[PDB]
Amino acid sequence: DTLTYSNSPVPNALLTASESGFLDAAGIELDVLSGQQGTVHFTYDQPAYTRFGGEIPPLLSEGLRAPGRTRLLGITPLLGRQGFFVRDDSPITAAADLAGRRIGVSASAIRILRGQLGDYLELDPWRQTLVALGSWEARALLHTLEHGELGVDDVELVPISSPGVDVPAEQLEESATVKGADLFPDVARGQAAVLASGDVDALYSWLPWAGELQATGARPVVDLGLDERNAYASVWTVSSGLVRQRPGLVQRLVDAAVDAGLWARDHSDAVTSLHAANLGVSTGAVGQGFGADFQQRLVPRLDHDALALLERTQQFLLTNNLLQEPVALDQWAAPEFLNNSLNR
Numbered sequence: 001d002t003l004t005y006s007n008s009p010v011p012n013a014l015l016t017a018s019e020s021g022f023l024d025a026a027g028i029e030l031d032v033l034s035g036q037q038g039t040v041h042f043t044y045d046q047p048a049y050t051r052f053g054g055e056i057p058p059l060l061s062e063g064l065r066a067p068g069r070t071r072l073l074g075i076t077p078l079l080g081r082q083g084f085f086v087r088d089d090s091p092i093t094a095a096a097d098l099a100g101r102r103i104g105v106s107a108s109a110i111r112i113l114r115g116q117l118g119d120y121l122e123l124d125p126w127r128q129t130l131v132a133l134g135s136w137e138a139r140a141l142l143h144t145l146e147h148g149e150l151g152v153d154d155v156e157l158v159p160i161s162s163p164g165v166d167v168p169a170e171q172l173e174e175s176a177t178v179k180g181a182d183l184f185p186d187v188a189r190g191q192a193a194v195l196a197s198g199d200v201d202a203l204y205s206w207l208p209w210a211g212e213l214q215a216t217g218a219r220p221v222v223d224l225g226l227d228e229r230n231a232y233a234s235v236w237t238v239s240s241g242l243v244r245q246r247p248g249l250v251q252r253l254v255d256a257a258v259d260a261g262l263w264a265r266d267h268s269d270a271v272t273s274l275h276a277a278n279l280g281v282s283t284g285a286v287g288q289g290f291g292a293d294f295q296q297r298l299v300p301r302l303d304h305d306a307l308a309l310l311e312r313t314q315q316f317l318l319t320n321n322l323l324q325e326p327v328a329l330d331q332w333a334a335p336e337f338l339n340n341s342l343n344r
């Protein structure tokens, strides 16, 4: 059987199972989305498509645009190096030092931080979701400033390009695939240039990109990776029709991912290498961006704690008017598959 697929720059068992041969052994092959069919990463408009990535796009698709296209198979938390970075030689060493300083943020984050979404509800799926992705910077800045007893009104917001948030349709369509290596090349080099421009004092970085940025000689004012309130819930989705029409196939898919997750615990280097190649980053940056022993936490989850994390992100979207009505997570989830896999 052949399924189309994609994954965000996050640790996940779908990519692991595919590159390690577990899917092949299960008689399943995956074809990554080309740049020309890349919008599916945000719309889920395909009959046999599966994605393991950030939760914002699927929450918007299910809760705002097209209820019913997907089912949730599992969750894998994400937490690692994260925060507003400054150059090592910067006199800024504490959160309080950000008072009155120039914070570089995406146009999307600026809409959210100002509480002025503009034409948000009238935008097409791709551009609309990109506005919501400004949430990462927005929440991170609020939490960072809290440490210095400051608020957003205490700093200067300056527009800059942020990876994953600023992705023009032309850029997407020109990319060979939606793999991080093709869509997000040399991110840290670009962020280091922004910090060297003389027009900004700090900017948001995370994922392996933050690891490479740190290597250029930069540091986070506050490492948000040290506090769980900055974690996100990566989600694994699949076309709803496959769940209803081909449960046997979905079960084989989930079994393979679970086996790959167990296997990963004893093959840390191989797992680090395959994620690094998929995203186009150094192997050392993977560990910094996802956490030292992320390979021990790759078996997908649907327990109460994992669902609460996903709900937390959803609430940030609702509070900030990026969603009007919430997605019923218990209905969206199809726990039977993961439950059967873990009972083997």
Ligand SMILES: O=S(O)c1ccccc1-c1ccccc1O
Pocket (backbone or CB within 6 Å): 007, 008, 009, 041, 053, 054, 055, 056, 057, 133, 163, 164, 165, 167
């Ligand atoms: O998928 S998102 O949640 C996501 C999460 C984290 C980093 C990048 C993206 C992303 C943004 C735009 C287009 C493709 C992407 O993978």
